[PDB]
């Protein structure tokens, strides 16, 4: 992989630039009109203006997409999350046009597209799912917090998993509901299942959890989610230059032996001119945003500003290096979520 | 610990602050009338200004950092790194005023001030000392050019025990990096051990870092000690996985480590670029995966010159140097200090330079 094109904006704009440059990779960026002063088009080495600001206009346009990819000699594109991450089509076309969709073939996204489809794809691997008036009775007879696994896979057949992540406002990893050992289990019938449907790249499989501890698989997600950093900081693993590496054609050299959960992390999204922006820092903190003092967002497309993401070695830890991140974080000119978010954190309950 | 008075200025104020917090300590931050705009002052619960711009004056006064701590329910003193960390007098000073000094007894810091003194006190605690004079002649050594700077970080309690926490090659200090090319598992295990039993036999307390010089051939010779916290320091925490700052406050509120030896590993490679001098209108650091920003800085700040050039400091890691080495480059080509010229520019050469590449 030499050039990439990004097709997103914002936050994830930013990391897959970032992901690219510390692997080498040239970077061009799809922009809107509305995102013309995004830091994106800044940290990326080239930038095409693709269309007007509304979205189907430009990010869920792939003719727009292709023809920037091919303008700018980007060999690939990234799709990022939301959008056409998990559009069959776009990553038809890129294959069409000789760029390299980093991402799941096109495949393993429709049958995963439609729940219900996906679900019986997963009860046919042996993945866990939900369990005449007469047959109904007897049916009845013989018969929850969110949590999230991490996948990711080569184009030879190996994958591993990543680890579960707690549920969105906040999330958490690891999950303060789950033991090594179904973490474990979890994830195994994960792989498994996402080695059924041939997937290649990231993703994210969602259950739902008993008291008891049994889980039921509910959707997967083709694409990298807005809840990546989180996985990453508890298990030392880059997914977006992963991500970048297997769709280069490279062998995933990682294992599941050499994958650990080691501390605690949490993340918190921050959402709505940020005259000024002072992220938080120090030790503990990490910032995935795409402020900057002198941002006047655009309110075409989210709500999202920034993602601070705290861990420790516990989960208190954690919960109290955030406290102070986002009584750190100063994003003013514009009302945000933090205040909501500190109260959530130092909820009794939570 | 109740409350703690941040004796010093700068990016490090906002470490001590930000460690205070996470262990519930409320803080004080001590100002000079240049320093009011600080970000310290924002973060900090209270301030109070010690003086006037010049150090002497403001933040080498023991008596109105002493009084400060007095009249603002502080029981602690945390002295930072330089004017008064090392001043063996403040800590005595503090004690007598009932107030703890976050940091080392004041013989340890006496014996160690000297570099003569230091010098000799470890050599009779088995520690290699350079080849040169025995006590003082000003002190001679011998140059030795063939050598590298490391570093040992130590750290101890008040009932006798004590951890090392590493090396850091302190060579190129612009930049600061963990692990050593040069030192392995077994040689820090050896550095590390000769550090823990001179710090023993000095009767040390608190965060301290033995600097040593290491030969082509691998052997160590140590030149000197700061009994404080260093500006280098975030390298080693993100090798490790321990906060020295949290630490420091906790062994003075009179807490057991309860680290053992086996406990600290270096799993990671980090370094650090102290981004120099050589009003911030636009402020921006930089961030992502495998970044820490340690800094004062915001986009208005007018920074003063007074005491020293550092504008910010920036750590990346990684499971490879060069993976350490890449995503500095590109903190380096994100961080955006508008309105004063700074140091990055020859930070991202020298980071894609071949000799420290190798």
Not at 238 to 261: C, M, Y
Not at 281 to 308: N, Q
Request: net charge negative.
């Amino acid at each position: 992989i030499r050039k990439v094109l990004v097709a997103n904006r914002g936050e994830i704009a930013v990391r897959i630039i970032r992901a690219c440059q510390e692997l080498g990779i040239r970077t061009v960026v799809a922009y809107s009109t509305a995102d013309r002063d995004s830091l994106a088009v800044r940290l990326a080495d080239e930038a095409v203006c693709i269309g007007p600001p509304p979205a189907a206009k430009s990010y869920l346009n792939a003719p727009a997409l292709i023809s920037a990819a091919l303008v700018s000699g980007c060999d690939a594109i990234h799709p990022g999350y939301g959008f056409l991450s998990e559009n069959p089509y776009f990553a038809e076309m890129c294959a069409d046009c000789k760029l390299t969709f980093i991402g799941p073939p096109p495949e393993p996204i429709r049958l995963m597209g439609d729940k219900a489809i996906g679900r019986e794809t997963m009860r046919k691997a042996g993945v866990p799912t939900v369990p005449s008036l007469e047959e109904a009775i007897d049916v009845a007879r013989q018969i929850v917090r969110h949590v999230e696994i991490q996948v990711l896979a080569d184009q030879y057949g190996h994958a591993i998993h990543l680890g579960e992540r707690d549920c969105k406002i906040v999330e958490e990893a690891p999950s303060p509901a789950v033991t090594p050992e179904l973490r474990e289990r979890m994830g195994a019938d994960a792989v498994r299942g996402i080695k059924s449907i041939g997937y290649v790249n990231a993703g994210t499989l969602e259950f739902l959890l008993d008291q008891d501890g049994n889980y039921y698989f509910i959707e997967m997600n083709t694409r990298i989610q807005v809840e990546h950093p989180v996985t990453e900081q508890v298990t030392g693993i880059d997914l977006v230059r992963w991500q970048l590496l297997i769709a280069s054609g490279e062998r995933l050299t990682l294992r599941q032996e050499d994958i650990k959960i080691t501390r605690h992390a949490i993340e918190c999204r921050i959402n709505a001119e940020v005259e000024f922006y002072l992220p938080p820092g120090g030790p503990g903190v990490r910032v995935d945003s795409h402020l900057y003092s002198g941002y006047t967002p655009p309110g075409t497309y989210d709500s999202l500003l920034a993602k601070i993401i705290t861990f420790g070695d516990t989960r208190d830890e954690a919960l109290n290096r955030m406290r102070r991140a986002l009584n750190e974080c100063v994003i003013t000119g514009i009302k945000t979520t933090i205040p909501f978010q500190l109260a959530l954190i130092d909820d009794p309950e939570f």
